Write a structure and sequence with these properties.
The complex is a heterodimer of chains A (9) and B (139). Chain A is largely without helices or strands and 9 residues long. In chain A, 0% of the residues lie in helices and 0% in strands. Classes of the chains: A little secondary structure (9), B mainly alpha (139). At the A-B interface, loops of A face helix 6 and helix 8 of B. The PDB classes it as protein transport.
Chain lengths: 9, 139
C-alpha cells in the first residue's frame, strides 16, 4: 500500500 | 479451495519428510487467483522465514523461490517492496535476527536476493536492498 522505507543495517 | 494460510501451512510444515510440491505449487497458483493474494502471500512468507525452527524457514524460502520464478508482475512487485524486503534483512543482520539464524537460512536469502537482481532488473528496490547488504559487509 505505501510502501515502507529501506532499513539501514 | 485452500486458503493461502492452509496452503502455506502444509508447504512449510516442520513435520514434512520431503518437499511437498502439491502445496508449494498450489500456493503460487492460489495467490495468483485473487487481486489480494500477492500482499497476503507475502505477509505469510515473511512470518515463516523468521521462524526459529529451521525446516520451516527453509521450506518457506523454497516457496518464495518457486513463486518468484513462475508467478508474474503482481507477485514480483509485492516482493520488491521494502515492506517485504526489510523482513528478509532482519533475518540476515546480526543486529536483528542474524545472530541466532543458521547460516543455511541466511545464505539462502542472500542467494535469492542476488539472483532476482539479475533475473528481475526492474525490481529496483531489490537491487538497493542487495547493494545495501553488500556495502555493509553482509554479502
Amino acid at each position: 500500500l505505501l510502501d515502507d522505507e529501506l532499513m539501514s543495517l | 479451495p485452500e486458503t493461502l494460510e492452509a496452503r502455506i501451512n502444509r508447504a512449510t510444515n516442520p513435520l514434512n519428510k520431503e518437499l511437498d510440491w502439491a502445496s508449494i505449487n498450489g500456493f503460487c497458483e492460489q495467490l495468483n487467483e485473487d487481486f489480494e493474494g500477492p500482499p497476503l502471500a507475502t505477509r505469510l512468507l515473511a512470518h515463516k522465514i523468521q521462524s526459529p525452527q529451521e525446516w520451516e524457514a527453509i521450506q518457506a524460502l523454497t516457496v518464495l523461490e518457486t513463486c518468484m520464478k513462475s508467478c508474474g508482475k503482481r507477485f514480483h512487485d509485492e516482493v520488491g517492496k521494502f515492506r517485504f524486503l526489510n523482513e528478509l534483512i532482519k533475518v540476515v543482520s546480526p543486529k536483528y535476527l542474524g545472530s541466532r539464524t543458521s547460516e543455511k537460512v541466511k545464505n539462502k536469502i542472500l542467494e535469492l536476493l542476488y539472483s532476482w537482481t539479475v533475473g528481475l532488473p526492474e525490481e529496483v528496490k531489490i537491487a538497493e536492498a542487495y547493494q545495501m547488504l553488500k556495502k555493509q559487509g553482509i554479502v
